[PDB]
Every structure is written in C-alpha cells, then in structure tokens.
Design a protein around this nucleic acid. Structure first.
Ligand SMILES: [Mg+2]
Ligand SMILES: [Mg+2]
Ligand SMILES: [Mg+2]
Ligand SMILES: [Mg+2]
Ligand SMILES: [Mg+2]
Ligand SMILES: [Mg+2]
Ligand SMILES: [Mg+2]
Ligand SMILES: [Mg+2]
Ligand SMILES: [Mg+2]
Ligand SMILES: [Mg+2]
Ligand SMILES: [Mg+2]
Ligand SMILES: [Mg+2]
Ligand SMILES: [Mg+2]
Ligand SMILES: [Mg+2]
Ligand SMILES: [Mg+2]
Ligand SMILES: [Mg+2]
Ligand SMILES: [Mg+2]
Ligand SMILES: [Mg+2]
Ligand SMILES: [Mg+2]
Ligand SMILES: [Mg+2]
Ligand SMILES: [Mg+2]
Ligand SMILES: [Mg+2]
Ligand SMILES: [Mg+2]
Ligand SMILES: [Mg+2]
Ligand SMILES: [Mg+2]
Ligand SMILES: [Mg+2]
Ligand SMILES: [Mg+2]
Ligand SMILES: [Mg+2]
Ligand SMILES: [Mg+2]
Ligand SMILES: [Mg+2]
Ligand SMILES: [Mg+2]
Ligand SMILES: [Mg+2]
Ligand SMILES: [Mg+2]
Ligand SMILES: [Mg+2]
Ligand SMILES: [Mg+2]
Ligand SMILES: [Mg+2]
Ligand SMILES: [Mg+2]
Ligand SMILES: [Mg+2]
Ligand SMILES: [Mg+2]
Ligand SMILES: [Mg+2]
Ligand SMILES: [Mg+2]
Ligand SMILES: [Mg+2]
Ligand SMILES: [Mg+2]
Ligand SMILES: [Mg+2]
Ligand SMILES: [Mg+2]
Ligand SMILES: [Mg+2]
Ligand SMILES: [Mg+2]
Ligand SMILES: [Mg+2]
Ligand SMILES: [Mg+2]
Ligand SMILES: [Mg+2]
Ligand SMILES: [Mg+2]
Ligand SMILES: [Mg+2]
Ligand SMILES: [Mg+2]
Ligand SMILES: [Mg+2]
Ligand SMILES: [Mg+2]
Ligand SMILES: [Mg+2]
Ligand SMILES: [Mg+2]
Ligand SMILES: [Mg+2]
Ligand SMILES: [Mg+2]
Ligand SMILES: [Mg+2]
Ligand SMILES: [Mg+2]
Ligand SMILES: [Mg+2]
Ligand SMILES: [Mg+2]
Ligand SMILES: [Mg+2]
Ligand SMILES: [Mg+2]
Ligand SMILES: [Zn+2]
Lengths: 65, 275, 131
RNA sequence: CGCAGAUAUCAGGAGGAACACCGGUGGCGAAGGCGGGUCUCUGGGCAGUAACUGACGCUGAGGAGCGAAAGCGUGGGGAGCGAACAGGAUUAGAUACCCUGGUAGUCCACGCCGUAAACGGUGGGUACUAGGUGUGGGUUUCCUUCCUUGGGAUCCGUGCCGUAGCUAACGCAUUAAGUACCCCGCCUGGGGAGUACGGCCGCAAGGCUAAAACUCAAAGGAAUUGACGGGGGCCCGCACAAGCGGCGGAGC
RNA sequence: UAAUACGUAGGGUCCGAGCGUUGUCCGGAAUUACUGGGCGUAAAGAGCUCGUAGGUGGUUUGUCGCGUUGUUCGUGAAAACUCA
C-alpha cells in the first residue's frame, strides 16, 4: 500500500481549482477510483470527492463523454 | 387554514370553511363599485338559457384592473387585501404613489405593506405585471392575457396558475392548469406568483341553504324527468333511459369543440384524462 | 453512579485477588480506613495505606497469598446493601464457615469482628462475609 | 407490439423517481434510519486550559414525545417499479413460480395508525479485571531528514481472535453473559390464545390490558452419529458415449 | 398364544386389630426462587428517549440521635412446645 500523498503538510491543499490534480485522480473514463489502489487518506479521499464533484457541477470534468 | 365546524345541528355537521383571518377591511372602497344583479339565466328574450342558475344573495360588483398596463413605472403600496364574493379569488387594494387606488387580484403569499411595480422594468417578485419579453422561462404566472392589451382573460383560477415553457420567435408555450399547452403571442402581459386562496377548493358547502346563497338552483335529475321533457324521462320504476346518456337537448357525451377556430392553429395539443 | 462504595471496594479486592494483583488503588474514606483496620488486624490484607493524590486522598491495599500461591480470600459477598439492609441481635450474630470466617459488624464501639461482638455482647449491622 | 413502417438509430422537447463509482465490515443518530451537490436555521459527540457551581447524581410506575414499512383521509403528483386483475405457458390439477401488460401504492403537503426476527434475539449507568490485530478523531513529544502509517504517550468511537471466568453448549470474553453495585420491564409445561368477554385508543383496518374451562405426559434449547439432500470438492463401474447383436411381432 | 404387569394358585413382602381406596392440606416444588431463579436463542428486556411521584446517592469537615443496636427493672393470661 502506497502513501497518503496529499497528507503531508508540505503537500498541496485540497480544493477544486486544481483541474490537473482532480484529473490525476479521476480515470480516463471519468469515474472515481478506489482507495484500495490510490493509497491515500479515507478523509483525504472524502475531500477529493467533494472537490472533484464540485468541479463536475461547475463543468470541469467530463460527464462520461 | 381550515376550521371544521362542530356538529351542533344536523344541517351543520359537515360544514367546513376556510378562515378569512387575513382580511383587514369591512366595507369596500366605494369609489370603485358598480351595480350588478342576479341575471336569472335569461337572455334578451327572457327565456331561460342555462338552468340551475338564478336567485340567491344579491352582490355588489367592483371593477378590478385586469388591464394592468395603464400605469407603468409608478409603484404602489398594498393597502388592504379585502374580499369580493363576486369573484373566487381575493382582491387587494393598492395605493399608487401617483394617487390612484385600483383593485387587482391577490396572489398567493401577498401581504399588506409590500411594494408593487407594473411595467417592463419591474422585478420578478410575485405580484408584478410585465409583458413576457422580460420574464424568465419556467416561472409560474397567472392572470395572463391573450393579446397585447386585450385584458387578462386566463388563469384567474383561485389556487392554480399557468406555467411558462419556452420562447420562440414571437410566441411562448404555456403549460396551463387544464393540462394543456398553448402557443400565444409574447406581447401580452402577465404577473408572477401563484394566485391566492389556494385552499378555497377545501370549502364544504354542506347545507342546501348556502348553495342557494351562492346562487345556483337545484338540478332535476334525468331518469326522473318525464319522457316528454327529457330523453331519460319515463319508465315505471327506475329505467336507465334505455340509451346512452344524452344532454337534455339530444346530444350525448363526446367531442364538442368546434375545431378550425382562429385559435385552433395556436393550440398545440389537447388535454388528457386518466393518463 | 458509584452508588455503593463499600460494594465497589470489596469487588475490587476480590477481582484483584482473582487477577493476581499486588496493589489496589481506591478513593480514601473513613469507612474504608476503619474496614481496612478490621481486615488487617484479622490478617487478610497484608497491609493498607493512605496517600495523597491529585484531587482526593486515596488508599492502596497490599494482600497476601498462601505459601503455595494460595489465595488469601476465597469469596466475598455483601449482606447489607442500599435498599436491602440487614441487622442482627446480640444472640443471632451471623455464623460464617462455622466461625472460620469473619463478619464485619457495626456496633456502638465501632466496627468489630464477630468474635469481638459475641464476647462483648454487643451487636449491630453485619457488613460483609469474608472467606 | 410491427408492414398504418416495428427495433435500432439521430435532433429536439416534456416530465417524475433516484443519485454508481467516492462507498469500507466506515460517520452520525437515543431509536427507527439516514448519504448527487449549494445556501439557509439548527441539534448532538470529542480533545487540551482545566476558569467557575458545587451532592444538582442515577434510573424511573403511571403520563407524555419519538418511532421502518404496510394501511386510511383530504387535495396535488404519478417516469419506473408493482399487490390485486386479465390473458400465454408448465402441470393430472396451478386461483403460483415464468411471459406479456397492468389499477391501488410507490412521490408531494398536512393529519392520521404505533405495530417488525424494532436482533447485538442481551434495559440503562458506574467502578475493576491479561493481550493480539485494524479504522476513524484529536492531541501532544522526540529520532528529528524534522520529509515520514519514523518513534512515544494520551483519550473517544469503531471490526475480529483470543486467556482466566462464566455458560446447557454452541459461545461471550474490558464495546462481557466475569466478578458487584442502583433502578425498571417480564416469566413460570404445550395447546387453547396474545385469542373469547371487558376497559382504553383509533374513522377504520385493528391496536393496547389480559382470562378461564377441556386435552395432551410431552413441546422445546445447544450439541453426538447416522441416514438423506432435485447442497459443494475429490473419485469408480458396458453408468454414459462410440460399436455388434439382440428380447418386447409370430410358432414353439 | 407360550405375561414376574390380566385372573387362579401356591410361595414370598409390608403391616397388624387394624389393613387398603378415595379427598382435602404441607413437602420434596429452589415448580412463585427474601434466605433462594432466570431473561440469546429453551419463557421472558418494552421498539427507543426525556422526565413527575416514588427508589437511590461521588468527600470530608459539625449537633441534635427521631433509622440502629446498647443494657436495667418494667408487659407478654391460662392452656399448648422445648428441658428436668
Ligand atoms: Mg476535510
Ligand atoms: Mg357533515
Ligand atoms: Mg359597510
Ligand atoms: Mg359594480
Ligand atoms: Mg317572445
Ligand atoms: Mg346545472
Ligand atoms: Mg328573489
Ligand atoms: Mg371568494
Ligand atoms: Mg390542459
Ligand atoms: Mg339528476
Ligand atoms: Mg318524477
Ligand atoms: Mg310542458
Ligand atoms: Mg323524446
Ligand atoms: Mg320513469
Ligand atoms: Mg323494474
Ligand atoms: Mg354521448
Ligand atoms: Mg463518607
Ligand atoms: Mg442479597
Ligand atoms: Mg430510438
Ligand atoms: Mg478553584
Ligand atoms: Mg428514574
Ligand atoms: Mg426522578
Ligand atoms: Mg412506565
Ligand atoms: Mg406510573
Ligand atoms: Mg407527540
Ligand atoms: Mg404527542
Ligand atoms: Mg415504504
Ligand atoms: Mg407510508
Ligand atoms: Mg383501501
Ligand atoms: Mg393519509
Ligand atoms: Mg389522489
Ligand atoms: Mg406522471
Ligand atoms: Mg405482477
Ligand atoms: Mg394468471
Ligand atoms: Mg408491470
Ligand atoms: Mg408488538
Ligand atoms: Mg431496524
Ligand atoms: Mg431498550
Ligand atoms: Mg450497567
Ligand atoms: Mg478471546
Ligand atoms: Mg482458566
Ligand atoms: Mg460489558
Ligand atoms: Mg446473567
Ligand atoms: Mg400455565
Ligand atoms: Mg399470548
Ligand atoms: Mg377490551
Ligand atoms: Mg389488546
Ligand atoms: Mg439448540
Ligand atoms: Mg455437529
Ligand atoms: Mg450405450
Ligand atoms: Mg427376448
Ligand atoms: Mg420376447
Ligand atoms: Mg398366558
Ligand atoms: Mg396383578
Ligand atoms: Mg406372603
Ligand atoms: Mg403434599
Ligand atoms: Mg427463581
Ligand atoms: Mg424462547
Ligand atoms: Mg424483550
Ligand atoms: Mg408493544
Ligand atoms: Mg437509648
Ligand atoms: Mg429497658
Ligand atoms: Mg417486659
Ligand atoms: Mg403457668
Ligand atoms: Mg414442637
Ligand atoms: Zn492525508
């Protein structure tokens, strides 16, 4: 199991501005992948989902094109 | 709300009414009243045209501004939301900064002290009138008109009002309470917000006396008429009339609209039942 | 709710004997001190003590065990409890293990053992049957 | 259901229900139960400073509030799904399993009804009692890169396994059934029957409180081995398959 | 159809001037569990909360002692039980 990449204090914050950051965690299909593969916080993942899905509603990530 | 009456006497057990706790006045603005009278369901000839109607409690008519275009760009205050029996809904009097008092229909949730503006610049808050060029698609409106200044004619329904759908060219499509969609010109005028007295349909008459009050007389059933006076008349006992029900003048159920109307093209589709 | 300090103390003692402890810490009280007097003078608890803690004075109990690991106290059951309280007359003093046990009796002089009460002719409330 | 142009497939429009992945043996809630987002008002739980009150504590007969789904009233809504209901089919028989459809309901608003295997089949609260393996929450402190599930300690909730003990056993095993304490519900063989009569509640369906007679001399719980299974894994036989020749036809 | 369980015989057992049946009541029945029960499934924790009355209390500093035991004489009929 790999590390909680976000969860350093040196690491970047959590938000929805980072379209590249959210793309890096959303697959090419456009779905949310699993913690079992991503290896980050369960909490961090909660934040990631909130940010990515805010971006989706603001039309920043494809809706299964 | 609703207050169900307590069954003191038998003829008063089922009588439930709506409380008019919101009214503020007890005598209508006298500068805006005209003489009216139960017409008795008779035309210039005097022969009864429509049955069941006539007699009842006399009522005083008041002119109310469905023409609400004669004043623009001048606000008015909601003076008093009073009751007129002649109409289903409630009429609220407005004080204009100009100095006119005019009657209008009272939309749902309107209370004394609010502001009213009428024109193409008004806000979208309920109670404002403005041609449909300036009204967002999807909103709920009432007291609609049928042409640019012919006076509102539709959706006076106490408790229900029309829904705007979409603007194309110079027409707008309306979802409207009969369940029907009407194409209509967009130069007409309308007002935003559902009409008031949404609970008026909750009334339970409950007493033939009050039905008479409201004015309509009794209906004489069909199969009981004599055969001479009506198609189902006759039959020693109870006999269905031996034929499919029919209007007293010999036309049974079924389509009645005269298609081809000038508005036949303006209509989009037709109302649905049991769908 | 600590609604029976005596019961809780006795439960702690027997539980510590079962778990094979050496020291048991409890909040200190006058009744605890005099009951420790009784038991230590009878020889069931190796020695007690009263110390000072962050808030209130407490006590630690030092037990013994039989030379072959033997437990010092076999059974502990309260008799007079909140709600159900039991007293005894000068003649009907309770008998535990036919005298092989010690019953703590509250009499005018204070708390004394069953033999002390029987010889003095005094009586009171029996606290606990210790064996 | 289609040759009246079906399916598919593409443009547009309508509209209702519900939000995969995040999403797990995870959060919260006292309990039912609750998760697409945004805002609005707001409840509950936890960590350090421990400032202040200072025996106010606990739990609770009656009472009263909450309380899944189904059901009922009123008026809206009603895509999908779908009791009941029609047909098609299997079957000796099918008022079912399956198919075509398809009305209540399913959703909204306000009232209702108060029962579930409402289960962790375990009432609430406090104190004590070896460990191992994880989550999430918040704190500190040090190898200190001071990056770091690096290391230490702490308290809250949350999964499993396990000593001693307990237990009828299966099993529980510090989030006890252990060893105690305080209070409350409840039970005394099986039917009869949670039903008859009665009282209370409900508009109802019914709900709550709760009998007797007569009959049976057992009914039930965990567990041991068989037997069997249109329950699973590994095996063998002219068992199957591939071949010949056959009896069931006639006389004898 | 071949009874130590029916009846007859013998033989045996208990008891005895009484012996059985029946019926009422206690017991074993800890089978209404105060002494001295249980609640997972065998019968049982209500569906879960707040909370009135009642029931119950986290400490030590202080008196009256009404809860209490402490002893002295002072009542407890006779008759019945226990000792001689
Ligand atoms: Mg966060
Ligand atoms: Mg009536
Ligand atoms: Mg007047
Ligand atoms: Mg008039
Ligand atoms: Mg004429
Ligand atoms: Mg009529
Ligand atoms: Mg007249
Ligand atoms: Mg009216
Ligand atoms: Mg219509
Ligand atoms: Mg008629
Ligand atoms: Mg007639
Ligand atoms: Mg005539
Ligand atoms: Mg005729
Ligand atoms: Mg007739
Ligand atoms: Mg007839
Ligand atoms: Mg007709
Ligand atoms: Mg004390
Ligand atoms: Mg006891
Ligand atoms: Mg298509
Ligand atoms: Mg202080
Ligand atoms: Mg209580
Ligand atoms: Mg209380
Ligand atoms: Mg109660
Ligand atoms: Mg009560
Ligand atoms: Mg309530
Ligand atoms: Mg209530
Ligand atoms: Mg439901
Ligand atoms: Mg429902
Ligand atoms: Mg019905
Ligand atoms: Mg209803
Ligand atoms: Mg309806
Ligand atoms: Mg619909
Ligand atoms: Mg069906
Ligand atoms: Mg059928
Ligand atoms: Mg269907
Ligand atoms: Mg029930
Ligand atoms: Mg549930
Ligand atoms: Mg409970
Ligand atoms: Mg407890
Ligand atoms: Mg274990
Ligand atoms: Mg052991
Ligand atoms: Mg426990
Ligand atoms: Mg138990
Ligand atoms: Mg019984
Ligand atoms: Mg019952
Ligand atoms: Mg009853
Ligand atoms: Mg009942
Ligand atoms: Mg069992
Ligand atoms: Mg077995
Ligand atoms: Mg073969
Ligand atoms: Mg042959
Ligand atoms: Mg043959
Ligand atoms: Mg014989
Ligand atoms: Mg015999
Ligand atoms: Mg004999
Ligand atoms: Mg007896
Ligand atoms: Mg018992
Ligand atoms: Mg049971
Ligand atoms: Mg229960
Ligand atoms: Mg119940
Ligand atoms: Mg005295
Ligand atoms: Mg005396
Ligand atoms: Mg005396
Ligand atoms: Mg005498
Ligand atoms: Mg005697
Ligand atoms: Zn993290």
């Amino acid at each position: 199991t790999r590390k909680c990449v976000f969860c350093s204090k040196k690491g970047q914050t959590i938000d929805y501005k980072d379209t590249a950051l959210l793309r890096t965690y959303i697959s090419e299909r456009g779905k949310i992948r699993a913690r079992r593969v991503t290896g980050n916080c369960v909490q961090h993942q909660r934040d990631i989902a909130v940010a990515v899905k805010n971006a989706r509603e603001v039309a920043l990530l494809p809706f299964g094109s | 709300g609703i207050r169900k009456y307590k069954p003191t006497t038998p003829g008063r057990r089922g009588a439930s009414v709506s409380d008019f706790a919101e009214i503020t006045r007890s005598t209508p603005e006298k500068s805006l009243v005209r003489p009216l009278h139960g017409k008795g369901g008779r035309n210039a000839h005097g022969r009864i045209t429509t049955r069941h109607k006539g007699g009842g409690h006399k009522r005083a008519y008041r002119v109310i501004d469905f023409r609400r275009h004669d004043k623009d760009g001048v606000n008015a205050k909601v003076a008093h939301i009073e009751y007129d029996p002649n109409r289903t809904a409630n009429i609220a009097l407005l004080h204009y900064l100009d100095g006119e008092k005019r009657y209008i229909i009272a939309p749902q949730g309107l209370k004394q002290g609010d502001v009213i503006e009428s024109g193409a610049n008004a806000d979208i808050k309920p109670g404002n009138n403005l041609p449909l060029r300036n009204i967002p698609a999807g909103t709920v409106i009432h007291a609609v008109e049928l042409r640019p200044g012919g006076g509102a004619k539709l959706a006076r329904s106490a408790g229900v009002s029309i829904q705007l759908l979409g603007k194309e060219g110079t027409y707008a499509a309306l979802r409207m309470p009969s369940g029907e969609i009407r194409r209509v010109d967009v130069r007409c005028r309308a007002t935003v917000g559902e009409v008031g007295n949404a609970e008026q349909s909750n009334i339970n008459w409950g007493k033939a006396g009050r039905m008479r009050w409201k004015g309509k007389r009794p209906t004489v059933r069909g199969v009981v008429m004599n055969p001479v006076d009506h198609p189902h008349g006759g039959g020693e006992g109870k006999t269905s009339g031996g034929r499919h029900p029919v209007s007293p003048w010999g036309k049974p159920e079924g389509r009645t609209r005269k298609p081809n109307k000038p508005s036949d093209k303006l209509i989009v589709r037709r109302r649905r039942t049991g769908k | 709710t600590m609604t029976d300090p005596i019961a809780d103390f006795l439960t702690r003692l027997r539980n510590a004997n079962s778990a094979y402890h050496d020291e048991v810490t409890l909040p200190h009280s006058k009744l605890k001190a005099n009951i420790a007097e009784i038991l230590k003078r009878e020889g069931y608890i190796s020695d007690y003590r009263t110390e000072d803690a962050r808030v209130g004075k407490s006590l630690v109990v030092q037990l013994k065990y039989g030379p072959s690991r033997e437990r010092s106290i076999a059974g502990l059951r309260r008799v007079s409890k909140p709600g159900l309280r039991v007293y005894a007359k000068s003649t009907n003093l309770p008998r535990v293990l036919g005298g092989l046990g010690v019953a703590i009796i509250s009499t005018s002089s204070g708390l004394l053992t069953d033999r002390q009460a029987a010889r003095q002719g005094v009586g009171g409330e029996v606290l606990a049957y210790v064996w």
